């Protein structure tokens, strides 16, 4: 599924990401933009045999099990296929674990490069929240 900006903002808000651990809702919409272009089925294979999955491009090295990433963890306790669902509940649950690490949203390199320190409130302008 490819979400529209506002559709995604509304779902993220229902799933408790507005001001989760200090990060406003716009941060999560912005991150989803530059990670996946709002696409829940997006995947990217990295050089170490891991793959990034779904709308927030969660990496299979640490966070989810795809059964094909060497010397890996499954910190979120889920198959990576659950991060390819149109319903983002499981992605959001895993993202909350990730962001509750010391690194915060600095886990998402695209967020750091394109979102961090910018007026992220633009990403929720005009939306029915």
């Amino acid at each position: 599924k490819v979400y529209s900006r506002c559709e995604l903002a509304a779902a993220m808000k229902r799933l408790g990401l507005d001001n989760y651990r200090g990060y406003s809702l716009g941060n999560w919409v912005c991150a989803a933009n530059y990670e996946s272009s709002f696409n829940t089925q997006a995947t990217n294979r990295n050089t170490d045999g891991s793959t990034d999955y779904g709308i927030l491009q969660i990496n299979s090295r640490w966070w989810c099990d795809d059964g094909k990433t060497p010397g890996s963890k499954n910190a979120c306790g889920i198959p990576c296929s659950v991060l390819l669902r149109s319903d983002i509940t499981e992605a959001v649950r895993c993202a909350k674990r990730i962001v509750s690490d010391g690194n915060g949203m600095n886990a998402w390199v695209a967020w750091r490069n394109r979102c961090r320190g910018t007026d992220v409130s633009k990403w929720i302008r005009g939306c029915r929240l």
Partner: antibody
Amino acid sequence: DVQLQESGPSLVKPSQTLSLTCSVTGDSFTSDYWSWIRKFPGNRLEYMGYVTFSGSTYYNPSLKSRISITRDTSKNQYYLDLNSVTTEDTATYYCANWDGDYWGQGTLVTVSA
Amino acid sequence: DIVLTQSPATLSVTPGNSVSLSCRASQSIGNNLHWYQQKSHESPRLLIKYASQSISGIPSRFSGSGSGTDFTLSINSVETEDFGMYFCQQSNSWPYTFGGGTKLEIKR
């Protein structure tokens, strides 16, 4: 299954360091985040902190700079060390994983001279 | 810190009847609210996570609802084994905080 068990002293003197251990079964240990929680009389629960598999920590500001939570990856154990204790650190101490699925039994610690 | 206020302080319930328990947050916490039971001489047990998400092995008679500042734990067909303390806990903001607890008493 993931099973937790706390250990450490039941009596510590004021100004000493309180040192507890949480021993974990299974193979999840290096993948999870690991927490300490304590219960005071009057059913007052306090989240003390947690340590992540990357080494990050979050600590309750109530504990100031007295608390450290550390892991030993090589033993499926983690630790609480609380410095300069006072009678106000008298409580039942629990270890738990971060999402709350797995809890130890709780261990009563009295701080008293 | 986020303050969680539970009410009432005590519930007295005849087994077979249903009840609900309230948790109110001092700021909005989205869905980031978790419910625990703590029976006498035992550790807390997670009953509901993220306001309304069910937990494997917990009876379906426990459910959770709410969002923002206002949350409700419901117990349909209360059993004697449900007696003890119930606590809400928020995970929205560090430091995590707990409500002061609601005691469930069995009426007889």
